[PDB]
């Protein structure tokens, strides 16, 4: 999954 | 005879964008990131986040640098850690889509 | 002499109840730290630049009675954290300011 | 120990 | 007949230019990097029959622009691909 940041 | 076909493979280059966005301590910018090869690409802009309101961060931009730190060629888990300890005006060096 | 009357001893003007609405983005915190004082839940800090600070309706000192029809008073702050993590859009806050 | 929220 | 869903933000274009051919409304180009290109559900050559319960076939190219400018969220498109 893509990380928030 | 001589037939000349000039300008084949012409390209207008890429644009480099240098923007500044405010980040509050421990409050995320609201932009999800993914790694495409070495580079770091913004995949989503969260509705109502600091990046959406500013209008300077977009779904598709490449993050070259953030506050004098090379982001291209880093794991997204490292960009997460670098960003978690950031606040105030963050300077982003980007290559828009 | 004979009858001395001292009225209004222990007079009080009551408390104010504030009903405010704040926008919250999915998985982006409002920017307000909370602590438990007895049963009630109290805002202890307002994070510099957060959604709560910009709105100007949430303050260091307020009591959180309710958030989006959910009783916050008498709940552990770990439960308020969980309730808030799954919230987005207009959140209606029922508060008792300091 | 005061949760962010 | 294709029935697809494509997200759009308020005042942010999908990236799909419209061409008129008689009564029917057509899509002529798909903008590089737009919400119509990244989704893969809108193509150069398809016919737009309806968008969110509104008849698009038989409407001017300027009316389809106005209808779309006031749209946001999930947009349901009824199409006839090329």
Author numbering:
A (entry chain C): 169 to 173
B (entry chain A): 3 to 99
C (entry chain B): 2 to 99
D (entry chain D): 354 to 358
E (entry chain E): 18 to 99
Give the text the authors published on this PDB structure:
The C-terminus of the severe acute respiratory syndrome coronavirus 2 (SARS-CoV-2) protein E contains a PBM (PDZ-binding motif) targeting PDZ (PSD-95/Dlg/ZO-1) domains, which is identical to the PBM of SARS-CoV. Targeting multiple cellular PDZ (PSD-95/Dlg/ZO-1)-containing proteins through short linear PDZ-binding motifs (PBMs) is a common strategy used by viruses to facilitate their viral replication and dissemination to new hosts. We solved three crystal structures of complexes between human LNX2, MLLT4, and MPP5 PDZs and SARS-CoV-2 E PBM highlighting its binding preferences for several cellular targets.
As a key component of the Crumbs complex that controls the apical–basal polarity and TJ formation, MPP5 may contribute to the lung epithelium breakdown observed in patients infected by SARS-CoV. The crystal structure of the MPP5-PDZ in complex with SARS-CoV-2-E-PBM was solved at a resolution of 2.80 Å. There are three MPP5-PDZs per asymmetric unit. Each domain adopts a compact globular PDZ fold, and an electron density was observed for the last five residues of the peptide in two MPP5-PDZs present in the asymmetric unit. As for MLLT4, the E PBM conventionally binds to the MPP5-PDZ. The C-terminal carboxylate of the Val at position 0 of the PBM forms two hydrogen bonds: one with the amide proton of Leu 267 and one with Gly 268 of the “GLGF” loop of MPP5-PDZ. Interestingly, as for MLLT4, a hydrogen bond is also formed between the carboxyl at the end of the side chain of Asp at position -3 of the PBM and the hydroxyl group of Ser 281 of the β3 strand. The alternative hydrogen bond with Ser 281 identified in our structure was previously reported in the complex formed by MPP5-PDZ and the PBM peptide of Crumbs. Furthermore, the side chain of Phe 318 in α2 helix, which prevents access to the binding groove in the unbound form, is located out of the binding groove in our structure allowing SARS-CoV-2-E-PBM peptide binding as previously stated for MPP5-PDZ in complex with SARS-CoV-1 E and SARS-CoV-2 E PBMs, as well as for Crumbs peptides.
